[PDB]
Amino acid sequence: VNSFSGYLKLTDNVYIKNADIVEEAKKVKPTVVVNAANVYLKHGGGVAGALNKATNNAMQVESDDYIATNGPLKVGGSCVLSGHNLAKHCLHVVGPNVNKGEDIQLLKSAYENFNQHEVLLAPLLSAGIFGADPIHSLRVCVDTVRTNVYLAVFDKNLYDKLVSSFL
Ligand SMILES: O=C(O)C[C@@H]1CN(c2ncnc3[nH]c4ccccc4c23)CCO1
């Protein structure tokens, strides 16, 4: 039993809710919140900008030190950093950004990072300002992630479309 509330069950291990991931993280304080990161961990907008703002920029400060030490992530890759006031840990995962021309096949590799964590609160990778089709992202999630994932979808209209079209 866990503390996630109001989710629709899509499969054995995938759950979905119309929710602001920032507000959901603040309330649940999950072990892991996933950030929709880029390779530079520059948290300017979308989910990343929102999560970073909620940490009062502490996420960005920590991320800048990480990059100065380790260099950029790979597209499809991830790193574990602090969850600050939102979660125990933040798993920064880089989905391909279609608006940069990155290969959508890398979306499966990106979701594979979730399998290293038993339970996660996450957005749909490569959705929103990353330019991929969120219906496709949900399909890849369901077909790739085997651990327990609670997906927060900010837009109510999109949430209803994702549920109604789910196979
Ligand atoms: O899910 C969707 O419809 C949109 C997807 C997923 N993203 C989010 N997901 C879940 N919570 C989110 N709070 C946010 C606050 C500010 C900006 C983006 C978000 C945001 C956004 C990018 O694309």
UniProtKB/Swiss-Prot annotation:
Described function: Responsible for the cleavages located at the N-terminus of the replicase polyprotein. Participates together with nsp4 in the assembly of virally-induced cytoplasmic double-membrane vesicles necessary for viral replication. Antagonizes innate immune induction of type I interferon by blocking the phosphorylation, dimerization and subsequent nuclear translocation of host IRF3. Also prevents host NF-kappa-B signaling. In addition, PL-PRO possesses a deubiquitinating/deISGylating activity and processes both 'Lys-48'- and 'Lys-63'-linked polyubiquitin chains from cellular substrates.
Gene encoding this polypeptide? rep
Tell me the part of the parent protein that is shown.
1025 to 1191 of 7096
- Enzymatic reactions: Thiol-dependent hydrolysis of ester, thioester, amide, peptide and isopeptide bonds formed by the C-terminal Gly of ubiquitin (a 76-residue protein attached to proteins as an intracellular targeting signal)
Binding partners and assembly: May form homohexamers. Interacts with N protein.
Localization = Host endoplasmic reticulum membrane
* Effect on the protein upon substituting S164L: In strain: Gamma/P.1
This protein's species is Severe acute respiratory syndrome coronavirus 2
* Full protein name: Papain-like protease nsp3
Q: What is its membrane topology? A: Multi-pass membrane protein
Q: What is the lineage of its organism?
A: Viruses, Riboviria, Orthornavirae, Pisuviricota, Pisoniviricetes
